[PDB]
Design an enzyme around this catalytic site. Structure first.
Site: not given
Lengths: 124, 126, 128
Positions: B101, B103
């Site tokens: 991930r 972000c």
């Protein structure tokens, strides 16, 4: 691993390439709205969006892909209030074939351009 | 090149598709917290995160993938000070399976939503 | 039932706390999580942007190694940054790591990064 660099476009100055091709997929660099001289084409967001997509069209061609093979686009923009203008031009390039897309408003782009677009595409 | 669209999401009106599938991988569009009627479900950042993830679940399933098959997520948010709250919801969906991930906080999202999430996932059994 | 892949989490770096992993390996590609400039103790290494960029690239080197990849096998980087005025300094360090092999790249100024860091980089790479 193939490295894609074409003098058909403004040179990738420093440590990047126009695209790579790896495992049957083309990963483009983000294009910004430079002409072959490396000049920003216009302050107009539609004109910039067009130059971007024209540049990307060229990268895809040189990489062994095309626009109808694009899996995913990411559109980084300076203003979300330009989204309709941008989207209009984008929709001229992605008319019948409609990739997956994300679009976000960033704080600032290279050279203070209004739009930058990167693609992932399948080799034909 | 397989184009994916599902009637459980608001219709892709515009030059995109809910997802594509290429070389055994699914590339989803960025999902925002709209219901099937195209309306933003809530102002609450956790309710928005849930709606994004439910929207991604349906896209993955229509493509023949699932959340346990995700390779990578990119989470674009309006406010970093909401990160822990968004994170709490995301961890309810990615509990057993923990993809890669990133972000980041962006300046603005489509329709002034607070969260937009895109995924790259693998097709199950082909 | 789940599609087959390899999850990468190395003890060489600060743990991915919560619902993510350092990388995944799927269909012969490595997808890294974005790396921020954390040191071996989990702390922001320095306020200096070149030190942060070094720390990010060294972290990514670790992840790539543990996943069975290497910098020469990177397809694409994305560099998220806090301030375009740092781009020249960031690029100088980046170019020391990507000297012989030059992947595809995008670089954008975001509004804010995790922990108020100045640079975060993610990669997609081939198994070496």
């Amino acid at each position: 691993m193939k490295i894609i660099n074409t003098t058909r476009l403004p040179e990738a100055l420093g440590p990047y390439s126009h695209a790579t091709v790896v495992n049957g997929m083309v990963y483009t660099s983000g294009q910004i709205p430079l002409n072959v001289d490396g000049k920003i084409v216009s302050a107009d967001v539609q004109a910039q969006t067009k130059q971007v997509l024209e540049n990307l069209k060229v990268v895809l061609e040189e990489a062994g892909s095309d626009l109808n093979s694009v899996a995913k686009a990411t559109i980084f923009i300076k203003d979300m209030n330009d989204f309709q203008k941008i989207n209009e031009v984008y929709g001229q390039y992605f008319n019948e074939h409609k990739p997956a897309r994300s679009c976000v408003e960033v704080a600032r782009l290279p050279k203070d351009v209004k739009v930058e677009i990167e693609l992932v595409s399948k080799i034909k």
